[PDB]
């Protein structure tokens, strides 16, 4: 599950890039990861 936002720009639209914060995992199997990444709209769906 990805929590994403319309990318940062000043209006004049009508996005497609998302600031996506999601809970992920690390090399250590117990502890986990909280990271953000920017994705094109075609690789995801709500």
């Amino acid at each position, epitope marked *: 599950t990805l929590q994403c936002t319309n990318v940062t720009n000043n209006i004049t639209d009508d996005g497609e890039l998302k600031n996506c914060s999601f809970n992920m995992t*690390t090399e250590l199997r*117990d*502890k*986990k*990861q*909280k*990271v953000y990444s920017l994705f094109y709209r075609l690789d995801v769906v709500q």
Partner: antibody
Amino acid sequence: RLVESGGGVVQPGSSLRLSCAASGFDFSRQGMHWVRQAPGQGLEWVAFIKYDGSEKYHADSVWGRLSISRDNSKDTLYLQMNSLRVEDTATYFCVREAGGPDYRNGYNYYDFYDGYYNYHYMDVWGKGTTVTVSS
Amino acid sequence: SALTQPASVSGSPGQSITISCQGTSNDVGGYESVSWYQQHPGKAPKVVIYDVSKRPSGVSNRFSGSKSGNTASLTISGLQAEDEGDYYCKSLTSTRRRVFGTGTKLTVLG
């Protein structure tokens, strides 16, 4: 271990900077308070800061006179006390209240790369640095 | 604006007593974050209650907490001399600031 420092006996109209130097935990991902207490009085709350330092909430008794700031790298909180008056005669504590260590589904979720969260309270509370504004 | 507490309580040893903290719906009545602090002379406060019902590890079972409406209460059963001190409640507010009670001076009676 918190080192609440920076206080002193000053004048009304002066200015001062406090320091809550933090050890024993990761200050860089933990939101803190300043908390003052006039001698023999209740805990007059001062100011909250975010775990990195963008949010700077304040009580309006201190705002924007006693401005909270921090350095995540130094592991040290600060209270930029500007335009001092007699109500700043107080004992300035250092308090953590927000947050939870995100132990969910039986596993420690953490935010950015296994930091420490706020823990709903403190492992060790504020000692209180004393600003004493007399005339 | 401070959360309102009774200036003082008092009790004979063994007596149970109660302290009230009355806020608004934007702090005490709006959240479960009410916590309670005990303070001795010349010392820094220690939290005896959090999330309004909860005791931090190491605290006596004589300390309980509760909330009804905009008024949260700390209750001490079986007062012992060492309970004497000042008691402050802290609450979280809608703007995510913190606010303290006006304080209560509790006297276990010699």
